[PDB]
């Protein structure tokens, strides 16, 4: 039981050895913890799970109690009081309602644990490039975490398997605290905002199951049914004895070795108001449409400061912040706000990329702003080239050049970043940023010329090419102050 037993993988904020604690030890002590796992994305899945749990067991009645609970840990009594019915809802190995599972799965073979590990399998190159046997024996915690991550962040297993309410691969955006406890409490909506957010069947999908081929209005899903939503038919196998978890390397009494899955489709009409992801607001006809943010053709990320990149992309480019973030803004508007964020880039069922910033000033923001400026310059230029290329009845990868160029841009610029970070201070900021501008100008010229290179000696495309380059320089010209 997640709410009782030890499963949370932690190590002291600035300390050493990994230990495994329980929810009470987390909620009822001034100990500074941080999650500790071999994988950033699993750390994000863990934090997401804890945030959801806290969201259903202890919403503050007002902002005052919110701040109060953040600055002051509960007593153990209050905790138990808060967790009882939810105690009954959280069992990994149970009779009728296993955690995020479905009893009575009809399958011929047992699915290996690797299918829950988000990138270990999914593609052919996976078999060739990854270390084998990463999922031969997973402890309880890693199993719960993996299940949740598969229910939210990862794409479905394959044909006949559905993805989360936020779509296949969404970006998750959390408010970053000083330690773990603070982070969890920080990303929990207060009761009033919770009501304003969810204006239903408020029972889990592993207690009140989904009906095959049924249509479900998104408005008809309770918030605990959605926060703990489960779209594929999964059922763990019986665990094994004491040994090392093949995923986290820790010792554990119970280790799971496989599970049973089966195809299961339905339909959720409309968009469930999930509080953990930013979204894009489009106006179509006269109606307002929203789509959750996802790493589509590129996953914007610089080393050390990816969270800033994402934050600025959400702030500046009609993107709307996540609900927990909006709440935090409204509670502490004058307070600085850094994100804990994560997401995958995927071909269908195969992951292509992972970007995850999970850690626990104005110059950096300026830097990111500049970078994105040059990125946009290049993208507009090469989209001009792309459209011109299409309209000229040409075929091939001439259309999708802007996407590849964007990805490449992020890479090379990431080669540029560490020195920039190293030389930044009060007096040197303007100069290092100027040098950065020069470098990025050069890099944009290079990536434009490179992405356009395979279409030399194509006499027609000259018109297109010309326009394209002009566009680039226009924007580049607009980027020098």
């Amino acid at each position: 039981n997640l709410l009782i037993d030890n499963w949370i993988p932690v190590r002291p904020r600035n300390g050493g050895k990994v230990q495994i604690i329980n929810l009470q030890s987390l909620y009822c002590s001034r100990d500074q913890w941080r999650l500790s796992l071999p994988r950033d994305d699993m750390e994000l899945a863990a934090l997401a799970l804890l945030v959801c749990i806290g969201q259903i067991i202890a919403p503050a009645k007002d902002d005052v109690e919110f701040r109060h609970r953040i600055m002051n840990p509960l007593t153990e009594d209050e905790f138990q009081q808060l967790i009882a019915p939810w105690i009954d809802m959280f069992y990994l190995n149970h009779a009728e309602h296993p955690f995020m599972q479905t009893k009575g799965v009809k399958a011929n073979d047992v699915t290996p644990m690797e299918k829950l590990l988000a990138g270990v399998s999914g593609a052919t190159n996976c078999a060739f490039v990854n270390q084998p046997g990463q999922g031969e024996a997973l402890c309880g915690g890693c199993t719960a975490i993996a299940l949740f991550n598969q229910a939210n962040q990862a794409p479905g297993f394959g044909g006949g398997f559905k993805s989360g309410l936020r779509g296949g691969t969404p970006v998750t955006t959390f408010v970053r605290g000083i330690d773990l406890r603070s982070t969890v409490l920080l990303n929990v909506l207060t009761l009033p905002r919770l009501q304003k957010q969810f204006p239903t069947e408020n029972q889990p999908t592993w207690i009140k199951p989904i009906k095959s081929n049924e249509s479900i209005p998104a408005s008809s899903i309770g918030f605990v049914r959605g926060l703990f939503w489960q779209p594929a038919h999964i059922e763990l196998c019986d665990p094994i004895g004491i040994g090392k978890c093949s995923c986290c390397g820790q010792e554990s009494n119970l280790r799971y070795t496989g599970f049973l899955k089966e195809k299961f489709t339905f339909t959720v009409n409309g968009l469930w108001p999930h509080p953990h992801s930013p979204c894009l607001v489009t106006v179509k006809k006269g109606e307002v449409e929203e789509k959750f943010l996802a790493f589509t053709t590129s996953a914007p990320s610089w080393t050390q400061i990816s969270r800033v990149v994402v934050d600025k992309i959400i702030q500046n480019e009609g993107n709307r912040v996540a609900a927990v973030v909006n709440q935090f803004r409204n509670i502490a508007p004058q307070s600085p706000l850094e994100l804990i964020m994560g997401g995958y880039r995927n071909n269908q069922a195969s992951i292509l990329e992972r970007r995850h910033d999970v850690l626990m000033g104005n110059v950096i923001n300026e830097i990111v702003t500049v970078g994105l400026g040059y990125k946009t310059a290049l993208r507009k230029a090469l989209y001009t080239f792309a459209e011109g290329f299409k309209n000229k009845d040409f075929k091939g990868a001439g259309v999708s050049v802007h996407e590849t160029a964007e990805r490449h841009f992020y890479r090379q610029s990431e080669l540029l970043i560490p020195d920039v970070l190293a030389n930044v201070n009060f007096s040197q900021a303007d100069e290092v940023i100027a040098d950065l501008r020069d470098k990025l100008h050069q890099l944009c010229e290079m990536l434009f010329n490179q992405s356009v290179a395979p279409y030399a000696h194509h006499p027609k495309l000259i018109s297109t090419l010309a326009l394209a380059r002009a566009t680039l320089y226009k924007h580049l010209r607009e980027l020098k102050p």
């Binding site: 006499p459 000259i462 018109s463 090419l465 010309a466 326009l467 380059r469 002009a470």
Partner: protein, 150 residues
């Protein structure tokens, strides 16, 4: 340090009929090394210094197209050569391709032929900078200016 292109322009402009007639009948840039009038023309513009030598060979060839073929016109960057060639409306695009794809010495001959045809109005020091460098970038730029203008 940098060649006074306007000074070279006016110099070429008020050159006597003879010296001019001698420079004009050259059929490729290097042949300008056989004409004394050439040396007397380009000597005050740094000819005794090699880099300037190559640059000046190109410039003086293009000018050797004739006294009244390249009309300098001040800036309001200024009219680039590609823009000028397009503005004339006489030059086919294919010829511009053949120009920017050509190799050494041939490029200057073809350019002089183009200049003779178009009789372009342009910022001469600008074209002078272009001729000074004349890398692949400059040739591509020539072509793209020419295209964007039409």
């Amino acid at each position: 340090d940098e060649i006074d292109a306007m000074a070279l322009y006016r110099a070429w402009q008020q050159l006597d009929n003879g010296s001019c007639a001698q420079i004009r009948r050259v059929s490729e840039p290097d042949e300008l090394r056989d004409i004394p009038a050439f040396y007397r023309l380009v000597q005050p513009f740094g000819w005794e210094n090699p880099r300037h030598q190559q640059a000046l060979l190109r410039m003086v060839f293009c000018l050797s197209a004739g006294k009244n073929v390249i009309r300098h016109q001040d800036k309001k960057t200024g009219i680039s050569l590609g823009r000028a060639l397009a503005n004339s409306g006489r030059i086919n695009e294919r010829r511009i391709f053949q120009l920017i794809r050509a190799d050494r010495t041939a490029d200057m001959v073809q350019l002089r032929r183009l200049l003779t045809h178009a009789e372009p109005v342009l910022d001469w020091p600008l074209m002078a900078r272009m001729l000074t460098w004349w890398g692949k970038r400059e040739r591509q730029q020539l072509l793209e200016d020419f295209v964007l203008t039409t």
